[PDB]
């Protein structure tokens, strides 16, 4: 599985009806996937991992993207992880600060890949929950919980190094 700018999809599915069980129950899951085609595959993978259901023996009842309810508010997201290392698997809890839940999940994937060299296929997303300012364990998120937060830009290394390449003036880093 690859990763891009992930979107949250709600997928509802059930096993195909049979004369023994006329009305099978409906199951839903939260799947973060680049598109719906891979969202269905991830839903089937997780359902087969949990229930005795396969794609051939079941069907997808509803698949739809879940829009962010408050895209304009900054929120703290807690994500519970289940990934595989070179050694055995481990359980993790990570906190991220983003405007959207899908953005938080993308940040979680990027951070896991950067810090533990874990690919997307090895990572299972268990639960993503928005959290208030309190109940945050990671000081990195907590240090931004300040109404009177101040910080300058000390070392602004200039870009456009190849905009006109030869100049008589050396650049400036203090602004």
């Amino acid at each position: 599985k690859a990763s891009g700018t992930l979107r949250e999809y709600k997928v509802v599915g059930r096993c195909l009806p049979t004369p023994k069980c006329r009305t099978p129950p409906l199951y839903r899951m939260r799947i973060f996937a680049p598109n719906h085609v891979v969202a269905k595959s991830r839903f089937w993978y997780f359902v087969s991992q949990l229930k005795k259901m396969k794609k051939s023996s079941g069907e997808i009842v509803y698949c739809g993207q879940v829009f962010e309810k408050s895209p304009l508010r900054v929120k703290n997201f807690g994500i519970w992880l289940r990934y595989d290392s070179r050694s055995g698997t481990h359980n993790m809890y990570r906190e991220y600060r983003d405007l959207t839940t899908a953005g938080a999940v993308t940040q979680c994937y990027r951070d896991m890949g950067a810090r533990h060299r874990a690919r997307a296929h090895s990572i299972q997303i268990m639960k993503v929950e928005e959290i208030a300012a309190s109940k945050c364990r990671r000081p990195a998120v907590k240090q931004f919980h300040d109404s009177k937060i101040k910080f300058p830009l000390p070392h602004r290394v200039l870009r456009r190094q190849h905009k006109p390449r030869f100049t008589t003036k050396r650049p400036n880093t203090f602004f």
């Binding site: 509802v12 199951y27 839903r28 899951m29 991992q49 359980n91 997303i125």
Partner: protein
């Protein structure tokens, strides 16, 4: 290299199944096999006479000759370049009727019935078989109860 023994490698092929040894049931002895009957061969270790070769075990052929207690079956056999239609003599105990042709015969009779019938009606009926079509879009009614969430289970070492 391996030996050229006739019964080499037949330790389990020519062996009675579990708790099914002893006297051969007499139903197999009193079944008739007309000419042109499709028959699949399965060897039986209880009877040593009329024993088919190991290469014909599980093969299906057609009966062309009949004797007092054996029949002649033409069975296709592939030998490294081609399929040879060769005839062998097999005793009755290693012979049973094949049920592959009876479904076709039943469908033929049903098609003949559907041809004689609905002919004076004027409406042509679908006689040819078709593969599984699309699943005939329908409605799913979740009366009251919402779909149940299925979160992944956190890992724990059990061993």
């Amino acid at each position: 290299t391996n030996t050229k023994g006739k019964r080499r490698g037949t330790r389990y092929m020519f062996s009675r199944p579990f708790r099914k040894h002893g006297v051969v049931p007499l139903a197999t002895y009193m079944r008739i096999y007309k000419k042109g009957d499709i028959v699949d061969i399965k060897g039986m270790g209880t009877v040593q006479k009329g024993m088919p070769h190991k290469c014909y075990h599980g093969k299906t052929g057609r009966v062309y000759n009949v004797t007092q207690h054996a029949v002649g079956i033409v069975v296709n056999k592939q030998v490294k370049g081609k399929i040879l239609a060769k005839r062998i003599n097999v005793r009755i105990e290693h012979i049973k009727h094949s049920k592959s042709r009876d479904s076709f015969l039943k469908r033929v009779k049903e098609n003949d019935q559907k041809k004689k019938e609905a002919k004076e009606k004027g409406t042509w009926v679908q006689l040819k078989r078709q593969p599984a079509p699309p699943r005939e879009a329908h409605f799913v009614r979740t009366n009251g109860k919402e779909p149940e969430l299925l979160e992944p289970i956190p890992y724990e070492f059990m061993a």
